[PDB]
Design a protein around this ligand. Structure first.
Ligand code: GSP
Ligand code: GSP
Ligand code: GSP
Ligand code: GSP
Ligand code: MG
Ligand code: MG
Ligand code: MG
Ligand code: MG
Lengths: 384, 383, 386, 390
C-alpha cells in the first residue's frame, strides 16, 4: 500500500489531491478503494460522495443555486451538502458546552434526509445553518482543527468540467490553511443565499483526471496550487504472471479461482513460457509511444488486466489497442509501424501489411492484417 | 462472423462501437444483432434506438430540468432505459429485501408512454429513491447477473459531443464499474440530486462514421470504455453468388427467381465475370486507401442494390462519381488515377480532357457520360 | 422528358435526391416542376412542402423543439419535417385496409396535422395521444403493408447546403436511407430526444434537395450524408440558347398571340448577332470552358442569365450588369485571368471589355478599367469571345 | 436622369438591384432619390422602407423571429414577430390585393390586415391572434388565385437596404435566396411559396415589392456574397464621378437645391475658391481623377475616393477639412502601415521634409524600422501640395 500511503499523506497535507495520468491506470480504482477502506462504507451516502464533472456541470449544482420547488429555494449543491455534513458530524464528536447537540443532531437529520425538504422544514434548515455558522467563529481554532470522522468527495474526470467556473469561492476556501481550524481560517459569504460558508478540515477531495486530452487538461496554476498531483503511471509489472494472478485473486476466493490460476498457465505457456510477456510488451509499447507522441498517451495497464486466454489478448489487441493506436497516428503509417517496430518489413506476419500499389505522387499505404494463433504471438514477440 | 464478435465484445466490455467508412453495414449489423437478441422488431420495451447529433445534450440524454408550472428533473433516454433495465433485472432476482410490488409499480411508471401526472411523478421519485436505497445494500454476486438483456443502439454516436452528452457515463459505463461489478460505482447526479449507476443488464452498440475527421472520436479516455469493431468494406458480398444470397435473404416469395435471371442478365453483360463488382470495389478501395485515408473507402451498400446494368450505371454516375469528385475537388490527376485513366485524356473515358488550356498552363477535364458497352469497357479498365 | 425521368428514377430508387450544380441551371426549376407534375398541386401544403435551408434553421425548427404555447405551457412542437412525415404516414394509412388500423382516429390525426390554426391546449394532448396510438400501430403492423403507401409526398429543400445539415438532420442521418424507412427490410424507429415520442420516415415521403456547388465553404464534405441522396449534376445547357430552343422555351408558358410577336423579337435579335442561331450557345460554351479551366467546373455561368434575352439591349444589360460583375467577383483584381476568359489577353485599348490604364505602379504592376461598349462594337467584342 | 432610368429598368427586369461602389459616390442618395421619385413620398412608412444591414443584423429581425412582448402589461413572452421584410412583403401583397378585381377576396378582411400591417405600435394579444388569422386567410387566398391576377399589382413597394454587404446576406435572407427571383415571386411562372421555420406559416414575395441595395465594395472583411446571391440581383457600378467637381458642375449641383438669394453668395464664394487653386475650374475634377487612377493601379478598383466628399466644398478651409478629415483617414485606412504606397498615390514618393502630407521622421529603429507622421499644411503650402498631385 504505497499509492494508498501517498494518497493518505497528501490528503493530510494539501487537503485535496488529483490523481492524474494516462487512461487505463488506476485512478478511479485507487480513489474508490481508498475511500471505501477509510470510511468503511462500500456505497456513497453520508460519509462520502462520488461525482463526475462534465461540461453540463455548473456552480449551481455544485455549491448552491436557485430552484423553483412557487418561490426560489436556494438549493445547496453536492459540495455544500457534504461540507455541512462533515462539519455537523465533526461537531458531534467535538465535546463543548456551546455546541448544542440537540440542534446539531436536527441539522444532521435535515442534511441526511434524502427526501426533498418541505417548506416547513426549509426554514428550519436555514435557521439551523445560521446557528451553525454563528456557532463556529466563536469556537476556538484548536478545537475546529481536529475533526475525527473524515468525509470524502471523489470528483472523477475533474478536468472535464470548467473547474474554475464550478469552484466558486472554493478557489480560496479549498486551501488547507484557509479551511476551518487552520491559522488563516476564512469563512466567506455566498451569493445566492448570503449565508457564510467555509470548507471544514473534515472533508477531503480526491480528483481523478486523464492527461491524454490536452484541450481539457488544466492549466490554471492558481487552481493547481490547491491540489497535490499524484501521477498514476502505467504499471506493466502488474501484467507479470504472478502479479496478474494475485490481482485476479481478489474477488476469487472459491474453487473457481482454481480454474483461474491454470487459465493463466495455458496463457503464458502459449506466449512462450514467458512470465514477462505482457509486462515487457506494454513496457516497449509505452516507451515507444512516449518518444513519438508524449508520455500522457501511454497505454494503461487495465487493457491487459482482464486477459486470461490468448483469444482475450487477441480481442484486447485488435479491438482496444490497435484502434487506439490508429486514432493516435491517423494515416501516419511509419510512426504506428515504428511503435510496433515493424518499420523495416512490409509483409509477412505483420499487423499492417503494405498494399502493392503506390500513389501517383509517390505515396504508399498499409492495411490492417488480422493475425490469429501462433502468428499473432509471433508478431507480438517482435515488439519485445 | 460479425454477429459472434459483437456478442463476444459486448459481454466483456459492456459497450461496442462499430466504426468504419460509410456504406459498410454497421447500423445494419447493430439492428440485426439487437432484433435477433431481443426477439422484437420494434424499439420500445427491451431495446431503444437513438441517433446522436449536435442537439443532443446531457439534459435530453441522462436528466435535465424541464418545466412540467413546476420545474421537474425529467430523466433522459439513458436514465429511462437504465432504470428500466435495472428494475426488469430486479424482477427475476429472488431475494427477501426486494419488495416486488414497488419494483413492479416502478416498471409500470418507467414503461408508461403517457406523460406522468404530478400525483404519479412524486410516486416515481419515491420508488426511484427506494430503488437506489435497495441496490446500495444488495450484494455484488446477486446484481452481477440480471436476467434479461437491454440494448441501446446509438447510431452515429460520434456526431454529438460524446464526452459532454455522456456526463456521468464516462465512469459508469465500464463493465468493472457497473452494478454488481468488482468496483461498483454509484454516482450522484447534479440535477436530481439522486444517485445513479448503470446496471450490467444494459448494453450499448454505437455506430460511427470515420470518414469525417471533424467528428472523430479523439477522446482517448472515452475509447477505453468501448470495444472498437471495424466494419470494413466487403467487396466479396458483390460476387454474383453472394449478391444472390444476400438479396434473397430479405424476400421469401416466388419472385426471387425474378431476382435470379435479372442477376444473370447483369453478369453476362459485365463480361461473364462473376467477380466484376467485387474486383471493381476492391480496386477502387485500394486506390482510395493509397491516395486518401483508409476510412474514405467506398462501402458495398452502393452496389448491393445493383440488379441490372442500368442500376449499376445510376449507382456509378449519381452516387460514387459525385462522391469521387467531392473527395478530390479540382484534383483531376488524383481522381484520374483512382479510375487508373491517368494517361487516357480522350476516348471512352469518364473524364475527357478539354482541348483548351489555361494561360498559366493549367488543364481541366470534363465529366463524360458513358452508356452501354462503352461504360462496361471503361469499368473493365479499372479492374 | 429526360431530366424529369432522371429525378423520377433516382427518387424512386433512392428516396432522396440532390440537384447540384452551378447557379442558374434550373435545379429549383426542375424540382418545383417535377413536384407540381407528380402531385397535381401548384401550391405547397397538402401533398408537398417547400422549405429553404440556411444558418438560422436548427433541429428545433426542422424536427421538433420546445416552444411556449398558451397560462403558458412548455410544449414540444414538431418542425416542418416531422409534420410532413407524420402527414405522409397518416395519409398513407388511409388507403391501407387492415383491422388494427382505427381509421376514425387516423382521420382525426390527419385533421390535426393539416390544421392551419395553432393547436388548442385541449386539442394538443389529443394530438399527442393520437401520435402515441399511431406509433403503437405502426410498430405492430407487418412490413409488407407499410412497404408501399398509396400517395406520394414531397419536400423540396432548396439551397440545402446553406444550412448545417448534419446538425439539422438529427436522426435523419439514419432514417432517410430507403432500407431504414417504414416497410423497408431494415426499418428503424428512432426515439427523439426532446419529446421522447418515436419517429420513422415513411416511404410516402420524398425529399428533394438542391445545392449550390459554386460556394466551397458550404459544400457537402460529410461523406455519410452523401450516401442517402442521389446526386444529379445539373450542368449549364447552352443548347437552350439557340434560336429554336429559345422559341420553344419562351413561347411555352404564354400560349397567347404574343408568340407571333415574340419570335419577331427573336428575329431582330439574332440578325443583330450576325444571323447566327448559335451565337449565345457558343458564347456560353466558350465562356464556361474558360471558367472550367481557370476555376473549378462548377463556378460556370448558368444558362438562366441568357434565357430572358430578347433584344440586343437585353443582352447588353445582362452582360454588363449580371455576368461581368460576376466575372469581376470570380477573379477579383486578377486582370490577366478575366481578360483571358474573354480571350482578349493580348488585346488592349480597342473595342475591348477591359481597357488598359496608361499608368503603371511603382512595383511595375498595372490595372485595367471596365469599358462600356454599345451598339455593334459590343457585338464585335462578343464575336471575339466565340 | 439616366442612372435613375438604369435603376428603373434593371429593377423592373430583375426585381432587385444593388448599387455597388466605393464610399462617397452617392449610392444611398441615388437609391433614396429614385424611391422618393417613384412613390412620391419624402419619408418611409407605408409604400417604402429603409434599413441598414450591420454586422449583428439577423434573420430573426428581418423575416421572423421570437421577439419578447408583454402580455396584458404584466409579463414578457417570446412570440414569433415578423421582421422588416415580411411586414413590408405582406403590406405590398395586401395593398396589391386592394386594387385587384376578384370575387374570392374578402376586402373587409384584407383591408383590416392592411391596418394590422400599418399601425406603428405593438400589437395587443387580443388583435395579434386576429393578425395571425388574417395572415392565414391571406395565404389561403393567394394559394388558389391564378397567375394572371397576381402578375400585375397596381402600386410599387420599395425596400432600400443601405450597406448591404455589412451583414451576412445569406444568413439574413434565408428563404429570400429562393424567393427573391422574379420568376419565383407571386404570379410569376415558377411561383414559389416557402414555409417559414419559426411561425410555421407560408410566405412568398409579391412582385409588388422591389429591393435597392447599396454595397460598399472598398472593405472586404465582410463583403463576400455568394454567387447564387449575385444571381438574384442586378449589379450597378456607381463609379466616383470627378466631373461632378468641375466649377460649373459643382455650381449646378449646389444650386439644384433651394436657394432664393444665396445662389449669388455661392457664386462669389466659389470664385474665391478656384482663384486660389490656380484659376483652374477643373482642379478638383482632375485631382480626383489623378488620385483615383493612382488608387486603381496599386489598390483595387473599388477602393477609390468618392466624389461627394468635395460636393460641400465651397471655401479653401472647407477643402482643407475635407482633405485632412475625410479622404486622408480613408487613404490611411486603406494603406495601413504601407507608407511608400500611400506616398505614391499622392506621388510625393521620395520627396520628404518639404511641403508634404506625410513627413518622414528623422529617427530609425533598431532593425531599420521606419515611420511617417501626418503633417498638417495650411495656407499656400497646402494648395501647393495639392497642385503636385496632378
Ligand atoms: N487490482 C487492481 N485493479 C486495477 C488496478 N488499476 C486498475 N485496475 C482495474 O482496471 C479498471 C480500470 O481502471 P480505472 O481506475 O477505472 O481507470 P481510470 O483511471 O479511471 O481511467 P480513466 O477514467 O482516466 S479513462 C478498474 O476497474 C480496476 O478494477 C490496480 O492497480 N489493481
Ligand atoms: N444482407 C446484408 N445487407 C447489408 C450488409 N451490409 C450492408 N447492408 C445493407 O446496406 C445498407 C447500408 O448499411 P448501413 O447499416 O445503413 O450502413 P451504415 O453503417 O449505417 O453507414 P453509415 O451510417 O456510417 S453512413 C443497409 O440498409 C443494409 O441493408 C450485409 O452485410 N448484409
Ligand atoms: N424551360 C426551362 N427554364 C429554365 C431552365 N433552367 C432555368 N430556367 C429558368 O431560369 C430561371 C432560373 O432557374 P432556377 O431554378 O432558379 O436555377 P437554379 O438552379 O435554382 O439556380 P440557383 O438557385 O442555384 S441560383 C427559372 O425560373 C426558369 O424559368 C430549364 O432547364 N428549362
Ligand atoms: N446633389 C447631390 N448630392 C449628392 C450626390 N451624391 C452624393 N450626394 C450627397 O452626398 C452625401 C453622401 O452620399 P451617400 O449617399 O451617403 O454616398 P454613399 O455611397 O452611401 O457613402 P457610404 O454610405 O458608402 S459611406 C449624401 O448626403 C448625398 O446627399 C449627387 O450626385 N448630387
Ligand atoms: Mg475513471
Ligand atoms: Mg448508420
Ligand atoms: Mg434555387
Ligand atoms: Mg450609404
Amino acid at each position: 500500500k504505497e499509492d494508498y500511503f501517498r494518497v493518505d499523506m497528501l490528503l493530510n497535507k494539501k487537503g485535496q489531491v488529483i490523481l492524474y495520468g494516462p487512461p487505463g491506470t488506476g485512478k478511479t480504482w485507487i480513489a474508490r478503494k481508498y475511500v471505501v477502506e477509510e470510511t468503511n462504507e462500500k456505497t456513497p451516502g453520508n460519509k462520502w460522495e462520488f461525482i463526475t464533472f462534465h461540461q453540463s456541470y455548473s456552480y449551481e449544482e455544485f455549491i448552491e443555486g436557485f430552484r423553483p420547488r412557487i418561490r426560489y429555494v436556494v438549493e445547496d449543491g453536492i459540495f455544500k451538502k457534504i461540507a455541512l455534513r462533515a462539519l455537523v458530524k465533526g461537531l458531534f464528536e467535538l465535546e463543548d458546552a456551546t455546541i448544542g447537540k440537540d440542534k446539531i443532531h436536527r441539522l444532521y437529520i435535515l442534511l441526511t434526509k434524502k427526501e426533498p425538504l418541505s417548506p416547513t422544514e426549509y426554514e428550519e434548515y436555514l435557521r439551523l445553518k445560521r446557528y451553525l455558522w454563528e456557532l463556529v467563529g466563536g469556537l476556538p481554532k484548536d478545537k475546529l482543527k481536529n475533526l475525527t470522522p473524515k468525509f470524502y468527495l471523489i470528483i472523477d474526470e475533474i478536468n472535464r468540467g470548467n473547474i474554475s467556473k464550478i469552484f466558486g469561492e472554493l478557489i480560496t476556501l479549498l486551501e488547507k490553511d484557509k479551511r476551518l481550524g487552520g491559522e488563516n481560517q476564512l469563512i466567506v459569504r455566498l451569493p445566492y443565499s448570503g449565508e457564510p460558508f467555509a470548507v471544514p478540515p473534515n472533508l477531503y477531495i480526491i480528483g481523478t483526471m486523464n492527461t491524454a486530452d490536452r484541450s481539457i487538461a488544466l492549466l490554471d496554476v492558481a487552481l493547481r496550487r490547491r491540489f497535490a498531483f499524484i501521477e498514476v503511471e502505467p504499471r506493466p509489472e502488474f501484467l507479470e504472471k504472478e502479479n496478474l494472478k494475485k490481482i485476479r485473486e481478489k474477488k476469487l476466493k472459491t474453487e473457481d479461482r482454481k480454474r483461474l490460476n491454470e487459465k493463466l498457465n495455458e496463457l503464458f505457456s502459449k506466449l512462450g513460457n514467458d512470465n514477462y510477456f505482457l509486462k515487457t510488451l506494454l513496457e516497449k509499447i509505452n516507451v515507444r509511444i512516449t518518444v513519438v507522441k508524449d508520455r500522457d498517451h501511454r497505454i494503461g495497464h487495465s487493457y491487459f488486466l482482464n486477459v486470461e486466454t490468448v483469444e482475450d489478448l487477441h480481442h484486447v489487441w485488435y479491438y482496444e489497442v490497435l484502434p487506439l493506436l490508429m486514432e493516435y497516428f491517423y494515416n501516419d503509417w511509419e510512426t504506428i509501424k515504428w511503435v510496433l517496430n515493424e518499420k523495416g518489413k512490409e509483409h509477412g506476419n505483420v499487423f499492417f501489411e503494405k498494399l502493392r500499389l503506390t500513389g501517383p505522387n509517390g505515396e504508399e499505404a498499409y492495411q490492417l492484417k488480422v493475425l490469429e494463433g501462433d502468428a499473432f504471438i509471433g508478431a507480438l514477440k517482435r515488439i519485445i
